[PDB]
């Protein structure tokens, strides 16, 4: 079995827009150079989350049919997915992108940034569970698009229009599981398992913000 030309096209548009992302050299130099203090560590995470929201908006705009949605619905989707997309992208970087010694330095900074262990422990557990699935770049891209195009977010006016965009992405993802892992029929179910685990970070993050150093304009505005 294979993807239809229509599904191959949809996948290519998602993949091209996903691979455009890159961690700015400036931020990576800060991870290496900045002093090891709670204040400097917190600011590094702030710069990382601000960069991600910009990267997230650019990726979202390129999602097939996203631009054809009502303008208010476009904003409500961005707002509702911001936190989940952040944790998913942070899981990818942890299990891939950052070097062995460089990721050890970033982990040291996260564990000394003023974030309570009540929030650090489910975060690193999620990173490990994601790592266990050995997700392909196609799976990370499609899962991010599925998270963004969630028809059950608050304040969407035309939910059916969003469903029409998300259903083909779930179809493609399930087909890619059947093609690339035919011996593991529960692979798609495990991917859905990370989606529900992602939803819990909405409450973990909202509680974390309620505990309190301030925010960036993209942060407490997309985070409410």
């Amino acid at each position: 079995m294979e993807l239809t030309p229509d599904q191959q096209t949809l996948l290519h548009f998602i993949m091209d827009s996903y691979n455009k992302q890159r961690m700015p050299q400036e931020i990576t130099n800060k991870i290496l150079k900045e002093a090891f203090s709670a204040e400097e560590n917190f600011l590094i995470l702030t710069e990382m989350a601000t960069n991600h929201v910009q990267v997230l908006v650019e990726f979202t705009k390129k999602l097939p049919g996203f631009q054809t949605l009502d303008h208010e619905d476009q904003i409500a989707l961005l707002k509702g997915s911001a936190v989940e997309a952040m944790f998913l992208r942070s899981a990818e970087i942890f299990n891939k992108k950052l070097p062995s010694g460089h990721s050890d330095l970033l982990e040291a900074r996260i564990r000394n940034s003023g974030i309570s262990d009540e929030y650090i422990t489910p975060m690193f557990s999620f990173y490990k569970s994601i790592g266990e699935l050995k997700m392909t770049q196609e799976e990370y891209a499609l899962l991010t698009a599925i998270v963004i195009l969630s028809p059950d977010r608050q304040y969407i006016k035309d939910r059916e229009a969003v469903e029409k965009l998300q259903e083909p992405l779930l179809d493609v993802l399930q087909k890619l599981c059947k093609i690339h892992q035919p011996e593991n029929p529960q692979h798609f179910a495990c991917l859905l398992g990370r989606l529900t685990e992602l939803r819990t970070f909405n409450h973990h993050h909202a509680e974390m913000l309620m505990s309190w150093h301030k925010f960036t304009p993209l942060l407490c505005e997309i985070w409410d």
Partner: peptide, 12 residues
């Protein structure tokens, strides 16, 4: 409200 998200969304 959402002035930065709106700006980023609508540019180009």
């Amino acid at each position: 409200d959402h002035q930065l998200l709106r700006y980023l969304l609508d540019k180009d």
